[PDB]
UniProtKB/Swiss-Prot annotation, chains D, G:
Gene expressing this chain: S
Disulfide pattern: 3-9
Protein known as: Spike protein S2
Role noted for this protein: Precursor of the fusion protein processed in the biosynthesis of the S protein and the formation of virus particle. Mediates fusion of the virion and cellular membranes by functioning as a class I viral fusion protein. Contains two viral fusion peptides that are unmasked after cleavage. The S2/S2' cleavage occurs during virus entry at the cell membrane by host TMPRSS2 or during endocytosis by host CSTL.
UniProtKB/Swiss-Prot annotation, chain F:
Domain of life according to the entry: Viruses
Residues of the full protein shown: 544 to 692 of 1273
Protein name: Spike protein S1
Function: Attaches the virion to the cell membrane by interacting with host receptor, initiating the infection. The major receptor is host ACE2. When S2/S2' has been cleaved, binding to the receptor triggers direct fusion at the cell membrane. When S2/S2' has not been cleaved, binding to the receptor results in internalization of the virus by endocytosis using host TFRC and GRM2 and leading to fusion of the virion membrane with the host endosomal membrane. Alternatively, may use NRP1/NRP2 and integrin as entry receptors.
Disulfide bonds: 74-89, 102-111
Outcome reported for the amino acid change (mutating residue 71 to G): Increase of pseudotyped VSV particle production ex vivo. Increase of viral load in hamster upper respiratory tract
Subunit and partners: Binds to host ACE2. RBD also interacts with the N-linked glycan on 'Asn-90' of ACE2. Cleavage of S generates a polybasic C-terminal sequence on S1 that binds to host Neuropilin-1 (NRP1) and Neuropilin-2 (NRP2) receptors. Interacts with host integrin alpha-5/beta-1 (ITGA5:ITGB1) and with ACE2 in complex with integrin alpha-5/beta-1 (ITGA5:ITGB1). May interact via cytoplasmic c-terminus with M protein. May interact (via N-terminus) with host bilirubin and biliverdin, thereby preventing antibody binding to the SARS-CoV-2 spike NTD via an allosteric mechanism.
Outcome of mutating residue 4 to K: In strain: Omicron/BA.1
Glycosylated position list: 60, 73, 97, 116
Curated annotation (Swiss-Prot), chain H:
Purpose of the protein: Subunit of the fusion protein that is processed upon entry into the host cell. Mediates fusion of the virion and cellular membranes by functioning as a class I viral fusion protein. Contains a viral fusion peptide that is unmasked after S2 cleavage. This cleavage can occur at the cell membrane by host TMPRSS2 or during endocytosis by host CSTL. In either case, this triggers an extensive and irreversible conformational change that leads to fusion of the viral envelope with the cellular cytoplasmic membrane, releasing viral genomic RNA into the host cell cytoplasm.
Organism, scientific name: Severe acute respiratory syndrome coronavirus 2
Protein name: Spike protein S2'
Length: 241, 48, 321, 48, 96, 120, 48, 48, 48
């Protein structure tokens, strides 16, 4: 079917996730990996002001969303976003979560219609589906996601917390956890987000990860409480040394 | 790094050392202060 | 001292031993067999440009059943010795299957190059796993030539590790664009294998399966034919936890692992806590050797009597003699 | 000194631990001791 | 003096450093056990459980060389510190 | 010609023999190279240069720091109050005309302190 | 310290000679020197 | 530029070990010289 | 009487060999194959 229908923010020490699956306590550990730099320049979009443009996928994406009634619904990844190349789609259609890797012919302006869920103007056609997964049927919230693409594998880290403030990104430490690892093995260079059009009141932030050395302080219990970026300023360099 | 890349044809080994991370640090007390200390000591031992 | 005579004084000796004198094996109680039939006896194998991928979990990797009716002309493993494959557990098990030409079989290896390695299928430099390849001349070939297997000939770049591309756009070699039609300096990137029964050994089809797995860092569901044993606590034992061999004393722990965590490590990377594969409990592991020993003796020319000093221990707690 | 750019060498240097930190600590201790010796030898009188 | 010694603990700093370094070295020597030294892993058990007899020796030898080098460095630094403390003790004995 | 490197290229007074292509220092590092097309001689120099020191009081007291770049001017820039001391370029600390006892030794007769609106 | 059980490591350590013996000898010498220094500094009077 | 990722590591590790050994030797000799200079400075201070 | 030939002044692009050539044995010593596209060869000799 299909149909046709900047703001900057500081990264308040956000972008820390568990690097590997071991247990450590009361030990300061140094890691060398792709992280979101401290006090970075994260781009801010609204849906209240309604946009979802195609954003480049360079080396890894940090995506935060502040919402109340589930405006964000999913993402689309690919290099051309047409039937000529394989593309990945992750969607949450209010009853199931669907992850597909198909040569989708995506519509120019994808969206999900809510009156219940009545419209699926996402792609014109779907074929050559080599991977598909569906789960069992089923401002007050903030959700943080980290997407990485390494040697074909696609790694998704997730975290969620209740936040009641109005506009900005809340300041505070947050440690994401390993959620999903998928063997999609495709080329990803551009991505677009999926919005729930009602017939919104949310906002989101997008930032790019970079290779960094991080010093993480582990609490007495099994969690991380503080992080230091060895390239933010000379004092952090001295602290790392 | 404005006279280390210049017409020096690798005659000075100072640049050879500096390009490999070897650095020489200055002393805290310059010779103009050691001279004053020695002058004070000489005056004290001569007068008193 | 490396001498037959000892002068008067005090000398240091080796640490106290504390022999375990017991072996304990703990493995997940998996009773099913791995997909050996419907993977190795697959009637149709996917082409190299569209190599097939499968996930394996919750099975016992007992390859001893393969000797009766399987014969492989090429077998290699990277990152693990084959002889240990019977005493290990694999976290993520993936199997890639395809069919290629015989002389190209050597192209499936880390650091390699060529047609298959660059345009069809590539392996990472840090690859760990195994590669198996065997001749299938009497199964994939047919009289008159079998042309159902294809490969990619032209591409604008080199594939990343574990990358699959199925785009069939007309490849352009010259400056003029190819407007979806064949022509000079315009080609179809795909070609067909001309498998025939009378072809040479280098031109006969070969079936290739690559197994990828990761070891000793994550919870595992695929293990070998090893059998478990009852747990022992407050005692020094030899233990084999999901392929990890060690020796020490096991106690219950107050540590609480996250669901995705399996092992705990100290600063020196030594294992400190472990989750039981069956009882899902957390156990602390401690070393056994402890306590320096000193020998006090006069000159051996005088007498043979000696005294023994055990450091940093009581006498009441024993391990002393 | 060991690598001189070539990020692969810098990455491979990480598996060798804190040898460079120990070397730097020893050199800094020597540098501090030099100034301490100079001050001890010469700075003995309070009045100039 | 009775309250000067109670004013601050930095007056005994020359003693405190003697303790601090003696710990500072030791806690270092432990953590260098975490270095890979170019091997596949820093744990002997992983190598012994993943590799056979002929392939484990190559990694174990390099690990042994690295740990031996660390021990030699520690011993040399301890010897130098012992010489310095011996000189200080000789001065103290002469003063006494 | 297959040799990968990083550095600054300048014209050189060196004259290679016809069979020579590369020039080497004592440390075997490439120093001069003949251009494969323009047949000219080019000197290659490294880029990294100049030690950096961080001057700070106790972190329990304040977060303010000063940066000392060694063996460089401030006028030539690659540097980010400004004071040109005999030991280099100091940024983040102001200069006073008085003299006090040394608190944090900097060198070349210069010391630093944290004094009260507090600053270094 | 080098091996920590794992008899294979202990067997492979034998080809490296008597480095451990030399290390132990140096440490024992330092330990003896410490007590010698203490006795020299304090034990100077025969009568309590 | 001549070797791939898996073959360069073997050579780079040995080069790193050699350079680290050279640095360790230099640091040890510097420490010994520092001790000697400290003794000389103590003698000079006593004489002063 | 193996034949020897000298090669000079050409671009070594082996990508044209995939269409109609198949080799059962290929080995290289002193250089990784993957770097062969980004190198220059001084003296090129071929024995057949
Ligand atoms: C994109 C598809 C999607 C993904 C990749 C994902 C993870 C995810 N989200 C949630 C809770 C949970 N999850 C959601 C929904 C979301 N969080 C979102 O990013 C989105 C888009 C929704 C749906 C609108 C809600 C509204 C709640 C109710 C409070 C809470 O966040 O815990 C869980 C814990 C449930 C369990 O352990 O079985 C997980 C693994 N969830 C998804 O729906
Ligand atoms: C949400 O997505 C799932 C996955 O497509 C949908 O589940 C399918 O629903 C149709 C009937 O409408 C069934 O015929 C399919 O068998 C279902 N797929 C699977 C794998 O079971 C679901 O209907 C969608 N819900 C909404 C409201 O759109
Ligand atoms: C993955 O997709 C990107 C986008 O097309 C590819 O990048 C282009 O590749 C072609 C072929 O060399 C170049 O002509 C373009 O200049 C590239 N564009 C950009 C922005 O880089 C990329 O090559 C693909 N990855 C692989 C391994 O083929
Ligand atoms: C982010 O990018 C814009 C580009 O103009 C720049 O003005 C701004 O200073 C940058 N930093 C922040 C915190 O916005
Ligand atoms: C992909 O879709 C096309 C058109 O339906 C079809 O020809 C082809 O067989 C499918 N599979 C692959 C691997 O191309
Ligand atoms: C650490 O985790 C435990 C688990 O509940 C919790 O009780 C405790 O408050 C946390 N923090 C500290 C300092 O113990
Ligand atoms: C494949 O098929 C043959 C005959 O059906 C059988 O003998 C053989 O055991 C099978 N191979 C495996 C691995 O099961
Ligand atoms: C088998 O494993 C399960 C873990 O899910 C455990 O509950 C059960 O007790 C085990 N049974 C035996 C006989 O070990
Ligand atoms: C032996 O154990 C008892 C019980 O705690 C304790 O009093 C004693 O300190 C121990 N011996 C030594 C030398 O510490
Ligand atoms: C090609 O190389 C020759 C060197 O003999 C040079 O003279 C000429 O300028 C070069 N031409 C171009 C376009 O680079
Ligand atoms: C800065 O450059 C000028 C120009 O030669 C020079 O006079 C001065 O010595 C340089 N600064 C220092 C500290 O040498």
């Amino acid at each position: 079917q299909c149909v046709n229908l900047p703001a900057y923010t500081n990264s308040f020490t956000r972008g820390v996730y568990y690097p590997d699956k071991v247990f450590r306590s009361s030990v300061l550990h140094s890691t060398q990996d792709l992280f979101l730099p401290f006090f970075s320049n994260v781009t801010w979009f609204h849906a209240i002001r309604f946009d979802n443009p195609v954003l480049p996928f360079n080396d890894g994406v940090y995506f935060a969303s502040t919402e109340k009634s589930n405006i964000i619904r999913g993402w689309i990844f690919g290099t051309t976003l047409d039937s000529k190349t394989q593309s990945l789609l992750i969607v949450n259609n209010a009853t199931n979560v669907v992850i597909k890797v198909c040569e989708f012919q995506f519509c120019n302006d994808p969206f999900l219609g809510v009156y219940m869920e009545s419209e699926f103007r996402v792609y014109s056609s779907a074929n050559n589906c080599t991977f598909e997964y569906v789960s069992q049927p089923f401002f007050k919230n903030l959700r943080e996601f980290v997407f990485k693409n390494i040697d074909g594998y696609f790694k998704i880290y997730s975290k969620h917390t209740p936040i009641n403030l109005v506009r900005d990104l809340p300041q505070g430490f947050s440690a994401l956890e390993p959620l999903v690892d998928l063997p999609i093995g495709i080329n990803i260079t551009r991505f677009q987000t999926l919005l729930a059009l009602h017939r919104g009141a949310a906002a989101y932030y997008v930032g790019y990860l970079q290779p960094r050395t991080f010093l993480l302080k582990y609490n007495e219990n099994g969690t991380i409480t503080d992080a230091v970026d060895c390239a933010l300023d000379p004092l952090s360099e001295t602290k790392c040394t | 790094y404005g006279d280390c890349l210049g017409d020096i044809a690798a005659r000075d080994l100072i640049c050879a050392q500096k390009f490999n991370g070897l650095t020489v640090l200055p002393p805290l007390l310059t010779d103009e202060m050691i001279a004053q200390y020695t002058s004070a000591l000489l005056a004290g031992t001569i007068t008193s | 001292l490396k001498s037959f005579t000892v002068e008067k004084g005090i000398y240091q000796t080796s640490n106290f031993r504390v022999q375990p004198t017991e072996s304990i094996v703990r493995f997940p109680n998996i009773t099913n067999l791995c997909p050996f039939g419907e993977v190795f006896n697959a009637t149709r194998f996917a082409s190299v440009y569209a190599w097939n991928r499968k996930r394996i979990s919750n099975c016992v990797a007992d390859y001893s059943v393969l000797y009766n009716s399987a014969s492989f002309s090429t077998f290699k493993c990277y990152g693990v010795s084959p002889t240990k494959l019977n005493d290990l557990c694999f976290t993520n098990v993936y199997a890639d299957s395809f069919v290629i030409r015989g002389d190209e079989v050597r192209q499936i290896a880390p650091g390699q190059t060529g047609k298959i390695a660059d345009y069809n299928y590539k392996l990472p430099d840090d690859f760990t796993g195994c590669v198996i390849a065997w001749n299938s001349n009497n199964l994939d070939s047919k009289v008159g030539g079998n042309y159902n297997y294809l490969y990619r000939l032209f591409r604008k770049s080199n594939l990343k590790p574990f990358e699959r591309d199925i785009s069939t756009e007309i490849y352009q070699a010259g400056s003029t664009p190819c407007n979806g039609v064949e022509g000079f300096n315009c080609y179809f990137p795909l070609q067909s294998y001309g498998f025939q029964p009378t072809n040479g050994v280098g031109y006969q089809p070969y079936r290739v399966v690559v197994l990828s797995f990761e070891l000793l860092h994550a919870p595992a569901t695929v293990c070998g034919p090893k059998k478990s044993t009852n747990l022992v606590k407050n005692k020094c034992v030899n233990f084999n936890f999901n392929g990890l061999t060690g020796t020490g004393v096991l106690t219950e722990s107050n540590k609480k692992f996250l669901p995705f965590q399996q092992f705990g490590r100290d600063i020196a990377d030594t294992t400190d806590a472990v989750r039981d594969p069956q009882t899902l409990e957390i156990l602390d592991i401690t070393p056994c050797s402890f306590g320096g020993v000193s020998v006090i003796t006069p000159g051996t020319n005088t007498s043979n009597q000696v005294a023994v000093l055990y450091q940093d221990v009581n006498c009441t707690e024993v391990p002393v003699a | 000194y060991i690598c001189g750019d070539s990020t692969e060498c810098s990455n491979l240097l990480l598996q060798y631990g804190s040898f460079c930190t120990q070397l730097n600590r020893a050199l800094t201790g020597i540098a501090v001791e030099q100034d301490k010796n100079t001050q001890e030898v010469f700075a003995q009188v309070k009045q100039i | 003096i009775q309250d000067s010694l109670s004013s601050t603990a930095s007056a005994l700093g020359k003693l405190q450093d003697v303790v601090n370094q003696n710990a500072q070295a030791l806690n270092t020597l432990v953590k260098q056990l975490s270095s890979n030294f170019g091997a596949i892993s820093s744990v002997l058990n992983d190598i012994l459980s993943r590799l056979d007899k002929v392939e484990a020796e190559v990694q174990i030898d390099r690990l042994i060389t690295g740990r031996l080098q660390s021990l030699q460095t520690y011993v040399t630094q301890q010897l130098i510190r012992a010489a310095e403390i011996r000189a200080s003790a000789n001065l103290a004995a002469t003063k006494m | 010609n297959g040799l990968t490197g990083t550095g600054v290229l300048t014209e050189s007074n060196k004259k290679f023999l016809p069979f020579q292509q590369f020039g080497r220092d004592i440390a075997d590092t490439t120093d001069a190279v003949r251009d494969p097309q323009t047949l000219e001689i080019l000197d290659i120099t490294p880029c990294s240069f100049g030690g950096v020191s961080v001057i700070t009081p106790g972190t329990n007291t304040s977060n303010q720091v000063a940066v000392l770049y060694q063996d460089v001017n401030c006028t030539e820039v690659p540097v980010a109050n400004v004071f040109q001391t005999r030991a280099g370029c100091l940024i983040g600390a102001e200069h006073v005309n008085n003299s006090y006892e040394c608190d944090i030794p900097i060198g070349a007769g210069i010391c630093a302190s944290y004094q009260t609106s507090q600053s270094i």
